[PDB]
Amino acid sequence: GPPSGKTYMGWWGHMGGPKQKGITSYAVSPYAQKPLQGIFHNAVFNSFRRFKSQFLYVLIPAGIYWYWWKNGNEYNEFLYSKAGREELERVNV
Amino acid sequence: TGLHFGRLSLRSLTAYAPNLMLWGGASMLGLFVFTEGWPKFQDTLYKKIPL
Amino acid sequence: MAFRKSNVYLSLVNSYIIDSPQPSSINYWWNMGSLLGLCLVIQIVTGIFMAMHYSSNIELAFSSVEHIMRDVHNGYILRYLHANGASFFFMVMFMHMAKGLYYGSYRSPRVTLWNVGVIIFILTIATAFLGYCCVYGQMSHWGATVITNLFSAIPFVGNDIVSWLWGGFSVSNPTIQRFFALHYLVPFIIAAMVIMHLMALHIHGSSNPLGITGNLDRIPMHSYFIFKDLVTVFLFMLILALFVFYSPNTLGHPDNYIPGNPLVTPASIVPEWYLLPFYAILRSIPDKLLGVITMFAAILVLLVLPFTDRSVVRGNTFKVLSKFFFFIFVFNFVLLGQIGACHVEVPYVLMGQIATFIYFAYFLIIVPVISTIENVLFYIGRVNK
Amino acid sequence: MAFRKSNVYLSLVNSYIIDSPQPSSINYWWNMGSLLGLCLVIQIVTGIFMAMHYSSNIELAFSSVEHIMRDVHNGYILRYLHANGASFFFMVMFMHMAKGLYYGSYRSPRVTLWNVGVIIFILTIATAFLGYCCVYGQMSHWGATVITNLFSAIPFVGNDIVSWLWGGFSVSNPTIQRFFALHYLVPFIIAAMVIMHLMALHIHGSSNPLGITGNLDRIPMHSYFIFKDLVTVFLFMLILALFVFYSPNTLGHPDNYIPGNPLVTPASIVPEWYLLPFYAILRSIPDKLLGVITMFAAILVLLVLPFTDRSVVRGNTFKVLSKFFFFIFVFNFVLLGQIGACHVEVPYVLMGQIATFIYFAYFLIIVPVISTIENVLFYIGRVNK
Amino acid sequence: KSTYRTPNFDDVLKENNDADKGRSYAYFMVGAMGLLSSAGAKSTVETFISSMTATADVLAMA
Amino acid sequence: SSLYKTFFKRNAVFVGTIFAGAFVFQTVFDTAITSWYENHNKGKLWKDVKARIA
Amino acid sequence: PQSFTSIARIGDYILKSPVLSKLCVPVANQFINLAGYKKLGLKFDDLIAEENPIMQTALRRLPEDESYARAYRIIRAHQTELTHHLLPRNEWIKAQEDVPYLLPYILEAEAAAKEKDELDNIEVSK
Amino acid sequence: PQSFTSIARIGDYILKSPVLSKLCVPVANQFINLAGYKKLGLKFDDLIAEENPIMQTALRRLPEDESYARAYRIIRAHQTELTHHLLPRNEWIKAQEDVPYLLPYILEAEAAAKEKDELDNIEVSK
Ligand SMILES: CCCCCCCCCCC(=O)OC[C@H](COP(=O)(O)OC[C@H](O)COP(=O)(O)OC[C@@H](COC(=O)CC)OC(=O)CCC)OC(=O)CCCCCCCC
Ligand SMILES: CCCCCCCCCCC(=O)OC[C@H](COP(=O)(O)OC[C@H](O)COP(=O)(O)OC[C@@H](COC(=O)CC)OC(=O)CCC)OC(=O)CCCCCCCC
Ligand SMILES: CCCCCCCCCCCCCCCCCC(=O)OC[C@H](COP(=O)(O)OCCN)OC(=O)CCCCCCCCCCCCC
Ligand SMILES: CCCCCCCCCCCCCCCCCC(=O)OC[C@H](COP(=O)(O)OCCN)OC(=O)CCCCCCCCCCCCC
Ligand code: HEM
Ligand code: HEM
C-alpha cells in the first residue's frame, strides 16, 4: 500500500511519545476488591469541591444576562400600559 | 534579506498575478459558459456584434 | 493476528470501536458525539415509516399527518418521536460544538475536523426548515413566505431566484411538492459527511481536558468506553420517553394545528426554538440585503477561529480570563434566542442589536486580545529578569 | 511527497483513480464497471427532479406522470431518460457479470468481491419492480398482484405476510404509497454497497485476460486508462441519445398508457424485458410454494461457483471445452427471456421446463465435470510416462 | 525504594476474598441487563412493523 | 460453588436464558401493570358506566 | 483446487494402461494446440495460479537460473496481448521443451502438508 | 501561534521598566495560582502544545535526565484527573522549581528559522 503523510499519533507499540525509564505500575483485580465502592463521600464533599472552583465563572456571567432581560421586560410592560401613554408617543416615533 | 513575504513567498507578487488576470479571463469566462439558458442577466452577454 | 484485524470490513470496525487508542483522562463530555450517531438513526428510521402514509399535495398535506395520528397503528408514537427527537438532535449538537471550543480542539492539527463540522451544521438547519414546511400548518406557510422573500434583494438576480425557488408566484402547490423531495435527500448527505468526519479523527485521535499530549497513557475502546457509553444512551432514551408519552406538545406552537391559509395572517410568526437566535440577527439589520448576508455570515464566522487564537496552551482549563468570556458567549446565545420570540418593539430592537454585535466581537476582537495578554502573563510571572 | 498523497481525502482519490497499479494487458471489457458508476448517477439525479412533480396517491398517480410529460419544462427529457436509462443500467450489468465468470475472477483471492456483487444484483431487481409500480398503469397493477400473491404459500405464515405487504386486502392505495417511499431508499443502499465493493478490489486489484499474475508489468491509471475510459463514455451517451430522442417507447409496453383497473384484466401480463428469464422459471414449476423457492434460488446459485470450479488455470482463455459451455449458458438466458413473454401453451411449457434445468445443471453438473477432465488432459498431454 | 515492595491496597480490599463472591453478583447484574434489553428491544421492533398493517378506516370497510 | 456453575458459566445458557426469561417477563409484568392502571382509575372507565345504566 | 496428487494419481493410471492411452492421448494433443498458449511464448507451468500457500512454497525452492527465465516469458506475453498480434514462429515453444519444471517442487510441498494434518488429527491408544 | 521571540520581546520590556513591573507582576502572580496547574504536579513548560516543527526540535535537544522526569509528571497528572481528586500538598511544585527548562532550546530553534527564510527571499544587487 502507498504510505501517506506522517501524523502525531501511532498505534500500540509505536505510539510516538518519548522514551520512558524508571516508572513502575501496580494494580489489583476488580474481582478482588469491594462492590459498590464509589457511592458516598463523593457527592458529600468531593463533588462539592469540584464545582466550588467553577461556580464564580458561570454565575457572574449569568447575573448580568439575567439582570438585563428582567429589566427590559418591566419596560415592554410599562410602555404598553395606561400610565405609559406619553412615554410611548415619544420613543417609537 | 529581511524583505517581503508572509505565509505566501511575496516574491511571486506579480509572479502569480498577470496569468490569473487570464485565469480571471478563464473563470469569469467560465461564468460566461453557465449563464446560458437563464435569460435573467444575460443581457450582459447577448449584445455581441456577430449572431 | 486475530480475525477481527485480518478481515477487510471487520478491521474497519476494529480500528474504530474496539481497539482505538483513547486517552485515559476524558470525561462525560466526549459522549455527546456518540449520541448524535443514535440521534440520526432514530430520525431516519421513524421517517421512512411515516413516509408510507403521507401525501405531499397542498390540499392533502394537513390531513395525512392527522391520518397518521388517529388511524395508523401506533402512529402517534412515530410522529411524536419525529418531532421531539429533532429538538433532541439540536440540544446535543449545541453541547457538542460548545465542548470543542472550550477544550479548543479546532486548533492544529485538527482544522479539517472543524471545517467539515461547520458544513454539517449548515445542512442540519436546512432539513429542519424543509420538513417543518411539510406539515402545512399556519406557522408552516408564513415561515416559508418570510424566508424565501429574502432572496429578492440580490441585485439584478433576485426576482428570478425566488420564482425558481417557488415554482410560481407565491408559496404554491409546487413549493410543497419540492420541499418534501429535498427533505428525503439531505439527511443522506449528512450521513456521508459524518463518514468523512470520522476519517479525520482516526489520524489524530481525540484531545483531553488537560490539553497536553496523551500518547503516554492510553486505554482501548472495548470494555471501558463502551460501558461508559451506555450510561448516557440509557439516559437519552429515558428523557426521550418522558416527552413522547407525557408532554408531547410542549416544544411546539399551537398555530401549527390550524391548516395554512394565504389570506389570514397570524398575530405572531415565530420559529422553532432552535432557529430563534439566528432569527433575531436577521431582524436586527434594517435592510433585506444586509440582513440576509449577516445571518449567513454568522454560521461561517466559526472558520476564522483557528486563525484568531494567539495562545500557546490548548483549551480553557488553566485560562481564567478566557473562561470568563466563554460564559459571556453562552448566555448571549440564550438572550438572542429569547428576543427572536418577542415582538418588534422597544426595547427588543436595541437589545437584539447590541447582542448581535457581541456575537461578532467574540470571534474577532475578544479572542485575539485576551489570548495575547495571557501569553505575556504566563511569561513575566515566571522569568526572573 | 506531493499534496495528492498527503491529504486525507485526496489520497483516497489518488489511490483509486490516479496512481492505482493496473495491468498492462486489460481490454475494453474492463470498462463496463465504470459505466455503472455513471449509470447510477444518472438514475438518481433525474429521479430527484421528477420527484418534485409526483403524487403517490392511487387517484393521482396516473396524472402526475402526464403532468410531467405535457406541462413541465423539458419534462419529457427527464422521464424518457429515467425509463430508457434503467434498461441501459441492466444491459451493462449483464455484461459485467458475464465477463467476471469468463475470466473467472470469482476465484481466490476474490470471493468477497463476488459475494457483495450478488447482493447488489438482488437490490437492483427490487428497485426496478418498486418503481414500475409507481406509474400505476395497467401492467403496473396486475404485476404487483401476481408477485405479492406468491407470499401466501408459506405455511402458517402466508396470509399474514401478504396482508402486511398490502396494507389491506388487495393492491390498494396504501400499497402504492409504501412502494414509492421504498423506491427512494434502496438506491441509497446500493450506493453504500458499491463503496464496500470497491474496497475489496483495492487490496488485490484486477485480473487480466491471460489469467496469470500481473505484478511484473504495470501502468498507472492516469493518462492511459482515463483516456481509454472516455472512449466508451462518449459511446454510452450517444446510444442513450438515439433512444430518448428518436425511439423513446420501443422498450416498453403500450398497456402502461391505460390507467390501472382492478376490474378488467389484460389479455397478456408480461414483465419488462430484463425480468423475463426469471419469469419463465417461476411459471415452469406447477406449485406456488416450490415456484417462489426456485426463482429466489436462481440468483443465489452464483455463490456455489467458487466451490465448484476444479481447474488449476484461472479463466476460460486456454480452455476449449469450458468455452463451448459458456456460450450454451448465454443463449439459454435468451431463450428463457423469450419464453417469459409468450403464452402458457404447447410447447412453451416444456421448453421453459428443460431450459430452466440447464440453468441449474451448469453451476452444479457441467462445471465440475468439465473442469476436472481438463486437469487430466493438460497432464497426460505433456508428462512422458 | 525497591520494585519488590507493593503499595498498600487494604483501604479498597475486601476482608474475605472468596472467588465466587464477586463471580456471582457480577453475572446476576449483567444477566439482568441483558434480559430487559431483550424484552425492551423486541417490543420496539414490533411497534414499527405493526404500523404497516391494516389501517383503522380500512377495517371499517371490511 | 453450586451458584456460578448453575447457569452463569454456560454461554449457550447466557444467550438463551436471558432471552427465555424475557418471554415470561412480557406476560406477567404486562398483566401486573394492566391491573394497577384500572384499580387506580375505577369509576371512570367505560365498563363502570355501562353497568350503571344497566 | 483438484490436488496434483490426485491429478497424477488419475494421470498415471491412464499412462500405465496400454488400451486407455490409445484413446485419451490424441485427445490430449489436440486440446493443447487448440489452447494456443505456446504461440504467446509460454510453457504450461506458467499458466498455474499462484495465490495459494503451496504454489508460494514451490516458487521459492526453484533455482534462480529458471526463476529469471520465467519472469521474461510472462512479460513477453503481456506485450503480445496488448498489440493484439502473435509472436513469430521462431519464438514458439516446441513440443520438446514444454516440460514440467514445477511439478517436482509441487508434489513434495503437498505430501508434507498431508502429514502435518494426519499427525494433528490422530487417535493413538494405550 | 504568537512566537516567544515576540513574547520575550514584550516580556523583557515590562521587566526592564521599573514602573510597569509594579503593575503587571502582581497580576501575573494571581493568574498563576488561579490557573492551578501546580496542584496537578506540572510545571508550565509541560502545558505547551508540541504539534509544530519547532517544538519537535526543542524536545530532541533536551537532555535525557530531564526528558525522563517530564514523562512521569505527565502520567502522574492523567491519573489525578481520572480520579477527580488532587495531589497532596507534599507533591505540589513550589514557586522556586517552576523555571523554563525549554525556553533556551525554543528561542534558538526560532532564530535559525528566521534566517533560512530571510536568505531565501533576498534582493542582492550588483
Ligand atoms: C436533552 C439532552 C439529554 C441528553 C442526555 C444528557 C446529556 C448529559 C450532558 C451533561 C454532561 O455530559 O456533563 C457531564 C458532567 C459530568 O462531569 P464529570 O464527567 O467530570 O464527572 C463524572 C462523575 O464524577 C462520575 O460519574 P459516575 O460514572 O461515577 O456515576 C454516573 C453519573 C451519571 O452518569 C451520567 O451520564 C452523568 C451525565 O452520576 C452522576 O454524575 C450524576 C449526574 C446525574 O456533568 C456535569 O458536570 C453537570 C453539568 C450540568 C450539565 C448542564 C447541561 C445543560 C443542558
Ligand atoms: C448498451 C451498450 C452501451 C455501449 C456500451 C458498449 C459495450 C462495448 C463492450 C464490447 C467490448 O468491450 O468488446 C471489445 C471488442 C474488441 O475487444 P478488444 O478490446 O480486444 O479490441 C480493442 C481494439 O482492437 C482496439 O480499439 P481502438 O482503441 O484501437 O479503437 C477504438 C474503436 C472502438 O472503441 C470502442 O469503444 C469499442 C467498444 O474505434 C473504432 O473501432 C473506430 C470505429 C469508427 O469490441 C468489439 O468490437 C466487439 C463487438 C462485439 C461485442 C457485442 C456485445 C454486445 C452484447
Ligand atoms: C453557532 C454556534 C453556537 C453554538 C454555541 C452553543 C452554546 C450554548 C449551548 C448550550 C450550553 C451548553 C454548553 C456548556 C457545555 C460546554 C462544554 C464545557 O463547558 O466543558 C465542560 C467544563 C467542565 O469543567 P471541569 O473543570 O469540571 O472539567 C475539567 C476541564 N476543566 O465546564 C463546566 O464547568 C461544566 C458546565 C457547567 C454547567 C453550565 C452549562 C451552561 C448552563 C446553561 C445551559 C444552556 C441552556 C439554558
Ligand atoms: C444471474 C444471471 C447472470 C446472467 C448473466 C448472463 C448475461 C448474458 C448476456 C450476454 C451479454 C454478455 C456477452 C458476453 C460478455 C462476456 C464475454 C467476455 O468477457 O469476452 C469473451 C470473448 C473475448 O474473446 P477475445 O477478445 O479474448 O478473443 C481474442 C482471441 N484471443 O468475447 C467475444 O468473443 C465476443 C463474443 C460476443 C458474444 C455476444 C453474445 C451476447 C448476446 C446478447 C443478446 C442480446 C439480446 C437482448
Ligand atoms: C436529519 C434528519 C431529519 C430531521 C432533522 C428531520 C426533521 C423534521 C422535522 C423537525 C419535522 C417537523 C415535525 C413536526 O413538527 O411535525 C419533519 C417532518 C417530516 N419529516 Fe423529518 N427529519 C429528518 C429526516 C427525515 C427523513 C429522512 C424523512 C423521509 C424518509 C423524513 C420525513 C418527514 C416527514 C414525512 C415529515 C412530515 C410531517 C410529519 O409527519 O410530522 N424526515 N422532519
Ligand atoms: C451529526 C453530527 C455529528 C456527529 C455524528 C459527530 C461525531 C463525532 C464523534 C463520534 C466524535 C468523537 C467523540 C467525541 O469527541 O465526543 C466527534 C468529535 C468532534 N466533533 Fe463531531 N460530530 C457531529 C457534529 C459536529 C459538529 C457540528 C462540529 C463542529 C462545528 C463537530 C466538531 C467536532 C470536533 C472538533 C471533534 C473533535 C473533538 C476532540 O477530539 O476533542 N462535530 N464528532
Ligand code: HEM
Ligand atoms: C438504482 C436506481 C433506480 C432505478 C433502477 C430506477 C428505476 C425506475 C424505473 C424502471 C421506473 C419505471 C419508469 C417507467 O416505466 O415509467 C421508475 C419510476 C420512477 N422512479 Fe426510478 N429508479 C431508480 C432511482 C430512483 C430514485 C432515487 C428516485 C427518487 C425520487 C426515483 C424516482 C422514480 C419516480 C418518481 C418514478 C415515477 C414514474 C415515472 O416518473 O416514470 N427513481 N424508476
Ligand code: HEM
Ligand atoms: C452498481 C453495480 C456495480 C458497480 C459500480 C461495479 C463496479 C466495478 C468496478 C469499477 C470494477 C473494476 C474492474 C472493472 O472496471 O471491470 C468491478 C469489478 C468486479 N465486479 Fe463489479 N460492479 C457492479 C456490479 C457487480 C456485480 C452485479 C457483480 C457480480 C455479481 C460484480 C462483480 C465484480 C467482480 C468479480 C469484479 C472483479 C473483476 C476483475 O477484477 O477481474 N460487480 N466492479
Ligand SMILES: COc1c(O)c(C)c(C/C=C(/C)CC/C=C(\C)CC/C=C(\C)CC/C=C(\C)CC/C=C(\C)CCC=C(C)C)c(O)c1OC
Ligand atoms: C474517538 O473514538 C470514538 C468514539 O469515542 C466513539 C464514541 C465512536 C462511536 C460514535 C458514533 C457516533 C458511531 C458512528 C456513527 C454511525 C455509523 C452513523 C452513520 C450511519 C447511519 C446514519 C445509518 C442510517 C440508518 C439507515 C440507513 C437504516 C435505514 C432504515 C431501514 C432500512 C428501515 C426500512 C426497512 C423496512 C423493511 C421498512 C467512535 O466510532 C470512535 O472512533 C472514531
Ligand SMILES: COc1c(O)c(C)c(C/C=C(\C)CC/C=C(\C)CC/C=C(/C)CC/C=C(/C)CC/C=C(\C)CCC=C(C)C)c(O)c1OC
Ligand atoms: C478499476 O479502477 C477504477 C475505475 O475504473 C473507476 C472508474 C473508479 C471510479 C469509481 C466509481 C465509478 C464508483 C462510482 C461511485 C458512485 C456511483 C457513488 C455515487 C452515489 C451517489 C448517491 C451520487 C449522487 C449524489 C447526489 C447528491 C445526487 C445529486 C442531487 C442533487 C444535486 C439535487 C439537485 C437539487 C438541487 C436544488 C441542486 C475507481 O475508483 C477505480 O479504482 C478502483
Ligand SMILES: CCCCCCCCCCCCCCC(=O)OCCCOP(=O)(O)OC[C@@H](O)COP(=O)(O)OCCCOC(C)=O
Ligand atoms: C457502536 C458504534 C456504532 C457502530 C458503528 C460501526 C463501526 C464504526 C466505524 C466507522 C467506519 C468509518 C470508516 C470510513 C470508511 O468507510 O472509509 C472509506 C472506505 C474506503 O473506501 P473508499 O476509498 O471510500 O471507496 C473508494 C472511493 O475512494 C472511490 O473514490 P473515487 O470515485 O475514486 O473519487 C471520487 C470521484 C472523483 O472523480 C473525479 C471528479 O475525478
Ligand SMILES: CCCCCCCCCCCCCCCCCC(=O)O[C@H](COC(=O)CCCCCC)COP(=O)(O)OCCN
Ligand atoms: C466514503 C464515503 C464518503 C464520501 C467520499 C469520501 C471522500 C472522497 C473524495 C471527495 C473529494 C474530497 C476532495 C477534497 C480536497 C480538499 C483539500 C483539503 O481537504 O484541504 C484540507 C482543508 O480542507 C478543509 O478545510 C475541509 C474541506 C471539506 C471537504 C469537503 C468536500 C487541508 O489539507 P491538509 O491539512 O492535509 O494540507 C496540509 C499540507 N501540509
Ligand SMILES: CCCCCCCCCCCCCCCCCC(=O)O[C@H](COC(=O)CCCCCC)COP(=O)(O)OCCN
Ligand atoms: C456501509 C458504509 C461503508 C463504510 C465502511 C463499511 C463498514 C463495514 C460494515 C461492517 C460489515 C461487517 C462484515 C463482517 C463480516 C464479513 C465476513 C466476510 O468477510 O464475508 C466474506 C464474503 O461474504 C460477504 O460478502 C459478506 C459481506 C458483509 C456485508 C454485509 C452485507 C466471506 O464469506 P463467508 O464467510 O460467508 O464464506 C463464503 C460462503 N458463502
Ligand SMILES: Cc1cc(C)c2nc(SCc3c(C)cccc3-n3nnn(C)c3=O)sc2c1
Ligand atoms: C441558513 C438558514 C436557513 C433557513 C432555512 C432558515 N430558516 C429560518 S426560520 C423559519 C421560520 C420562521 C421565519 C417563522 C416561523 C417558523 C419558521 N420555521 N421554519 N422551519 N422551522 C423549523 C421553523 O421554525 S432561519 C434560517 C437560516
Ligand SMILES: Cc1cc(C)c2nc(SCc3c(C)cccc3-n3nnn(C)c3=O)sc2c1
Ligand atoms: C426477486 C424478485 C423480485 C421481484 C420484485 C420480481 N418481480 C418480477 S416480475 C413483475 C411484473 C409482472 C409479473 C408482470 C408485469 C410487469 C411486472 N413488472 N413489475 N415491475 N417490472 C419492472 C415489471 O416488469 S420477478 C422478481 C424477482
